[PDB]
Design a protein around this ligand. Structure first.
Ligand SMILES: CCCCCCCC/C=C\CCCCCCCC(=O)O[C@H](COC(=O)CCCCCCCCCCCCCCCCC)COP(=O)(O)O[C@@H]1[C@H](O)[C@H](O)[C@@H](O)[C@H](O)[C@H]1O
Length: 357
């Protein structure tokens, strides 16, 4: 749970947002802010709530509030910038999946998926989804920079689809540098993705694992972290053996080829043939659910405005309001789970049975 100062900052952000979406609210009790100031009310509203899929809205927002140390203004800055860069693109990327990438015969997205350069391989001790990246299979000639940005966003939004409630909504990355030579190195997309990520997927990384990777390419890190942001630095962990991989991942998900019991096909990819995508046709059912969901969103906005105003904090009605907001959030999560088969092409992880939403 949050404390009273924390709820203060969360209220400040939600207020800014309703002021963008023109829903009524009285912030004072505790006109448009400049970071948001070039965003369109109807559009940004619709997009932000399409982007709220299996996490609660408060969580979606508190991630940005934490990534800026609870400073209201830089938080609204970072967040409005996220909205202006995400819009309805990421939605489209993940709902079209691999299927509309194959369909649109986008060459680089297809090589990257086929390479299994980046893939989802299971869970760590904290039930976070884990992404195997093995750069020994990257070449800058395979894909264009923007196609690589798209493959990355897709892999990560697939990792987000796994998010266990009551467990971290972050993703662990296993970087197998085993096999890495200077043929494979492409700095431009790396920087671009890291900027992409820190500004747009804040508080989304659990651990950055560097496994059985060079034996002296660990030392220099160990005091550089004092000059790095302590949070991300503590997230990065260098391991060099399956015994150090047991500290983080359970043996059933570590691949065999590193000493695990996960026997997945790592060299042959079985792309979605579209056969669980049968509910992409039910336009009537999808709208049935989407109207129920808009009912939900309006309830949430009204209750959230009430919350932003109502005084005091010890008032019974206030605990009533908190309850309802949690009720609503959960209703919206259950609802997305109903909606999913009607908006989202089944992904490779839908077919093998690793992903249930
Ligand atoms: C050679 C090319 C390889 C092709 C290989 C390309 C294929 C890979 C495609 C996708 C891979 C997976 C996506 C990665 C998402 C990682 C999550 C993430 O966003 O990481 C961010 C941190 O940066 C990173 O994790 C590094 C990015 C990892 C993977 C993306 C690029 C991969 C390129 C790797 C280089 C080569 C391999 C070596 C391994 C090094 C790993 C970088 C956010 O940190 P976080 O603590 O979670 O929140 C921040 C917040 O956000 C900040 O603002 C705040 O200031 C701060 O206080 C915190 O709150």
């Amino acid at each position: 749970q949050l404390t009273e100062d924390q709820e203060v900052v969360l209220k400040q952000i939600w207020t800014h947002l309703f002021h963008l979406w023109q829903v009524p609210v009285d912030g004072t009790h505790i006109k448009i802010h400049k970071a948001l100031a070039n965003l369109d009310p109807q559009t940004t509203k619709k997009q932000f709530w399409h982007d709220i899929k299996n996490e609660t809205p408060d969580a979606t927002i508190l991630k940005f509030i934490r990534a800026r140390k609870w400073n209201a203004d830089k938080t609204i800055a970072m967040l409005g910038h996220d909205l202006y860069w995400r819009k309805d693109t990421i939605n489209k990327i993940i709902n079209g999946g691999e299927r509309a990438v194959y369909e649109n015969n986008e060459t680089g997205v297809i090589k990257n998926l086929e390479l299994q350069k980046a893939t989802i391989q299971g869970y760590d001790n904290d039930m976070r989804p884990v992404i195997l990246v093995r750069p020994r299979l990257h070449h800058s000639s395979d894909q264009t920079e923007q196609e690589l940005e798209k493959f990355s966003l897709l892999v990560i939004e697939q990792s987000k689809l796994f998010f266990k409630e009551n467990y971290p909504a972050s993703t662990t990355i296993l970087f197998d540098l085993n096999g890495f030579s200077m043929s494979n190195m492409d700095y431009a997309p790396v920087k671009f993705l890291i900027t992409c990520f820190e500004a747009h997927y804040p508080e989304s990384l659990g651990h950055l694992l560097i496994h059985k990777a060079p034996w002296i390419f660990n030392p220099i890190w160990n005091i550089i972290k004092n000059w790095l942001d302590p949070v991300v630095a503590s997230k990065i962990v260098f391991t060099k053996n399956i015994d150090e991989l047991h500290k983080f991942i359970q043996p059933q998900y570590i691949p065999r080829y590193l000493g695990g019991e996960n026997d997945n096909d790592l060299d042959h990819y079985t792309p979605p043939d579209g056969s669980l995508d049968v509910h992409l046709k039910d336009t009537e059912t999808r709208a049935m659910i989407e109207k129920e969901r808009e009912e939900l969103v309006e309830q949430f906005l009204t209750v959230t405005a009430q919350w932003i105003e109502h005084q005091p904090l010890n008032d019974p009605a206030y605990i009533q309001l908190q309850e309802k907001r949690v009720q609503l959030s959960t209703a919206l999560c259950e609802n997305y789970s109903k909606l999913d088969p009607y908006i989202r092409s089944r992904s490779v992880y839908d077919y093998n049975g690793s992903l249930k939403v």
